[PDB]
Amino acid sequence: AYTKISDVIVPELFNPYVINTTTQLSAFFQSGIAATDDELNALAKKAGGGSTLN
Amino acid sequence: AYTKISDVIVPELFNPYVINTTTQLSAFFQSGIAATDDELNALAKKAGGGSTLN
C-alpha cells in the first residue's frame, strides 16, 4: 500500500578522523628547574661523556 | 751573574726542552709506548679529572 520505509535500504555515514588530545596541562614552570647557565652549556658540548662532573 | 734563563726564569724555550729531552733519554723505549691517549690530558689538563679515566 505504502512504499513503507520498512523496506528500502538505508545507508550510513562517516566523516574524516580528528585528533583528540589527552590533557593534563603541564606547566609547573618556570621553577626549579630552569635558567640555563654556563658550565652546564660546557656539558652541552663535550665534555660530559660519563661519569664525572661537578 | 749569568744569562740565567732559569734565574730570571723565561718560561718559554725551557719546559718543552725539558720534557722532550726526558723522553729521549730514559728508556725502556720500547717496550712501553710513547704518546698515549689524550684523555689522560683531560686527566691532568682540566676538565674531567678527579679517580683516573679509563
Length of chain B: 54
Chain A residue with minimum CA distance to B46: A47
**Solving technique for this entry?**
cryo-EM
Number of Cβ pairs < 8 A linking chain A and chain B: 8
Q: What's the start-to-end Cα distance of chain B, in Å? A: 49
Q: What angle do CA A9, A10, A15 make, to 5 degrees?
A: 145
Return d(Cα B41, Cα B52) in angstroms, integer. Answer: 11
Q: After which residues do gaps appear in chain B, with C to N over 2.5 Å?
A: 50
What values do phi and psi take at A28, rounded to 5? 45, 25
Return d(Cα A27, Cα A17) in angstroms, integer. Answer: 29
Residues of A in contact with B50 (CB under 8 A): 52
Neighbour tally for A53: CB within 10 Å? 13
Return d(Cα B49, Cα B40) in angstroms, integer. Answer: 9
Return d(Cα B2, Cα B41) in angstroms, integer. Answer: 36
B interface residues, A as partner, C-beta within 8 Å: 42, 47-48, 50
Give resolution, Å, one decimal: 4.2
Sorted by sequence, the CB contacts under 8 Å of residue B30 that are 6+ apart come out as none
Sorted by sequence, the CB contacts under 8 Å of residue B48 that are 6+ apart come out as A47, A52, A53, B39, B42
Chain A residue with minimum CA distance to B42: A47
